[PDB]
Design a protein around this ligand. Sequence first.
Ligand code: SF4
Ligand SMILES: [Mn+2]
Ligand SMILES: [Mn+2]
Ligand SMILES: [Mn+2]
Ligand SMILES: [Mn+2]
Lengths: 95, 91, 340, 554
Amino acid sequence: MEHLYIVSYDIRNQRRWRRLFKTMHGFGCWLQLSVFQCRLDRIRIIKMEAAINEIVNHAEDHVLILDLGPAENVKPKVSSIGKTFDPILRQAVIV
Amino acid sequence: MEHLYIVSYDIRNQRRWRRLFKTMHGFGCWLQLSVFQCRLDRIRIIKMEAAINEIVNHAEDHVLILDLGPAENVKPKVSSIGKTFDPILRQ
Amino acid sequence: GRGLPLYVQSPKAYVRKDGDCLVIEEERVRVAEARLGETSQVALFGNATLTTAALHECLRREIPVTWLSYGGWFMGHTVSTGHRNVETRTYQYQRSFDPETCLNLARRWIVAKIANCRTLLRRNWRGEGDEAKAPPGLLMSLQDDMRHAMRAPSLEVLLGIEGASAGRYFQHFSRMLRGGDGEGMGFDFTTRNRRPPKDPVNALLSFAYAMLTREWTVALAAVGLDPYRGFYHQPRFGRPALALDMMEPFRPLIADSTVLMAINNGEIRTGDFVRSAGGCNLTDSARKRFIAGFERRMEQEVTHPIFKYTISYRRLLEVQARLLTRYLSGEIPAYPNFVT
Amino acid sequence: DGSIPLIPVRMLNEHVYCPRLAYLMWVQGEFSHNEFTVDGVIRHRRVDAGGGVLPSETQEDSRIHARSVSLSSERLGITAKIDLVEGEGAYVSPVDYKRGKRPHVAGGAYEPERVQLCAQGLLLREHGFASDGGALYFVASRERVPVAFDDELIGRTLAAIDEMGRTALSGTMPPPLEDSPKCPRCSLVGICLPDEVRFLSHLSVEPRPIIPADGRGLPLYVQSPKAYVRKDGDCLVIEEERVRVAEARLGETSQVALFGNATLTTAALHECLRREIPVTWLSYGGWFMGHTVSTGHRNVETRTYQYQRSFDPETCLNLARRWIVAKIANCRTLLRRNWRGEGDEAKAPPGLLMSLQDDMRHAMRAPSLEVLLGIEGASAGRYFQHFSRMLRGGDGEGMGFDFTTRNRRPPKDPVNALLSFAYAMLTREWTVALAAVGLDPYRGFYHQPRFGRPALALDMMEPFRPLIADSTVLMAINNGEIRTGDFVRSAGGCNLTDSARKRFIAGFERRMEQEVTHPIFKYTISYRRLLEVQARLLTRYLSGEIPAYPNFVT
DNA sequence: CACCATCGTGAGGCCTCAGCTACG
DNA sequence: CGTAGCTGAGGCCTCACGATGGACTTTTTGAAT
Ligand code: SF4
Ligand SMILES: [Mn+2]
Ligand SMILES: [Mn+2]
Ligand SMILES: [Mn+2]
Ligand SMILES: [Mn+2]
């Protein structure tokens, strides 16, 4: 069972920002100007929180990780006003 | 029963941004650089989504509203890496 | 033979197929050709390019394209889904259950290892000033042990005799240093091969042995052979039992020789080691200096597998592996080992 | 002699937990991760992976705070890499880090870790130290839990050393735990297969529901003949004509399939290699040219057993009988359940069912492989003769099957091409699954090795042809995935447009990720997981652990 | 389709605040 | 009067477009009840 995580950050050093944008494209897909949506099971959430405890500087950065739900029933939990919202789908890439 | 909502926006016009920062301080408390946490019951969530359908321009802005849970059990659902996270308390 | 491996050193390179030919280009300018008649594995170094048409033409002819990093670190193979090599693997597995197969190849490997050891004695003996030659009693002793290895009855006897002879070689290994005892680099004749290295010289020896084992593993897997099913050593626990079986002749030439190179060239000094309650381990700068040294020894040319054409060591390994698969399945009797 | 290496003390920790677990992890490699192994590595890495002070050889009076200290004694027979060593002058004490809370047991430390700490204590005593104690430093609450080297604790440790030595020298993998609560989290439950081996080895129970797979992704299909797959850090961007068509997250990718003249930049290939993500090169039409390997699979017992049994005739014969009997049974079942007639034809003709069942049984009583191949041919001929009976309620425009056009190189029917593509694209799945369990996909018992078709994937796919390949073809034609316009003629025969290939591949993927219920164990398992489970059960059967291979007849 | 993908410096676009004018 | 409202100056966030480069390291450890 996988969950849908929403990750939003404030990073106060451009190098650390590059490092974190690096890592986050490693894990989820871009959603908003500083927000990523990640569809992860347990192993990968452990990996993500391991990565973002060494990418960031705990003194002045801020990363927020929200566990919306079981990633099958997230659509009632998210309401988007501008663009459409479409959760990450677990299917192969055929192209 | 109240729920904890997290609201995050991208606004591409400074006037609309003022209008929305206006409205959002009306409803919740600042959390992150463009994120507000709101503890609302049903009447107030209806009010908030009513306000942010006329503050924003649907063509190019983007506002995201996440319903975390019943606002009593939100702490297991939120993990903050930098500052502390402390939900809105009703007192 | 049939053909030889092609090593594309240039990280710039772009490799295409020209009909029956494999063309190397540099900057839209040609470099060299292979032409697939005398080819073997195509080794591509870091960020080289191999056009997918050329890759398909390699696969259809069942040529093991191998990918190395820019430095030369192995990163993987690319084998074809044809019976080219499964014949070799099934011959290896069917024949590993035999007593003369195991015993005979073991006897050959040990006699070659001993011969390389004594040849390295007569090469690199540095008891200089008063003992320009090794004691011929030692040389006669190792010759006698070599005959014994020729006529060992069974595997356990060969293992015991091998251990003996290797020990008496290591007795005078320290005789081969910069001229005397290497105070600050002490060598223990008896604490050999315990898992943590208790001596700096033994630390170098173990690290060189491990790198040689890795090279042999990748060379064996390049050909269609299972490196983990050995004839002489024992298979399980994750030990590569065929790399360990075949690296025995090559221990003096690539491991002992590399250590002697890097210790008689001053590359490794007493300050490079850290000692801890029974463990002497290298420091990082020293570790990768020694890795460079191991490369430099792997880059040398030696001429005579059986055909005199001055191959680098890293390709002599493949030549030997192919000779092994060719001994199996019954082409060439008795696996003509490489001895100098 | 060298009949056994020095026992790593972590394998000593595992042996007192589950002897089968120690056997798997030590004598056959065979490790896999889950939530907790990954979490424990994460705990240990940030501090104790990096070294610290040395344990002084000459100890008089000074604090010893060594970290990641590697000892071994060969009189004892163990080797260790101690997480930390706290000692005042000459009285040292091992400290092992853990991951979780303090356990809810008397003494605060379970039986295994106590044995590990005692073993490290003996090792320290060997090198001239006075330990007489140790600790467990749980990283989560850093609640150091002391452990005292009681005497029968040392008795347990030495007994476990001897027990592991004997069970490794014997060469027989110890049975699984009996319905234990340890197994549902041992991170090898996908390899131990505890309940399945229990049930089939006649220690009969009811297999508990699948301890589900975790941390595995979905394939990457590159069907466009002009795609360029390049690395973009951890993503993997597939750009076609210099525009980003799609990205694939490498953490979520489990294979790569390169169809035709699709290019893969060497850096992307290296990054795939660093993760052992299999990369498979295919012709434009699905021919399986080659794949990527890396210095073999460290499990040797599996391959040794496979080859040694391959050299045995009646083992090959029994396996082949099982396989094609399963194939014929599945053909019958498919013919039934998806026959679509109108009236007096809407349900299967029993004469055909008589012929097919009689052929099933004639194969079950086969004398040798020659007659078995003959019977397989005859039964497949009848099945395909009736195959067209049952698609779209009859042939459509151009969607014409010719039963005599099967089994040869250029497909000159639309549906013949569709079948050949499905077969050649299931062979890849089987090859990957078989190579991922330590087996050698090319040494087969029934089929003979020939280019592009590994002899063992062709074997173990025989039961699954009707369930996956033919079923995908049927569902694709019926649902309207493919109509006649999707095909293009050629001098060779028939081929598919790109719009057809993408839709068909998506359909095949949906089939592979489509849950079923196992006839024998009765739990919902996806087909892709089922292939791995069946490969593992074949390894067990060749191992002599279970009496016979479960063929999955439905 | 020429080494290829990590590093990183500019120019613009979001996001907020302090400080102003009007004002009612 | 006071709070609504608009301007600047700085701080986050990302991208197209450039130049360097040229990682990979022994064996162990790593959960679970
Ligand atoms: S279920 Fe897992 S832990 Fe239990 S005996 Fe089997 S492999 Fe070992
Ligand atoms: Mn942000
Ligand atoms: Mn924002
Ligand atoms: Mn030896
Ligand atoms: Mn067949």
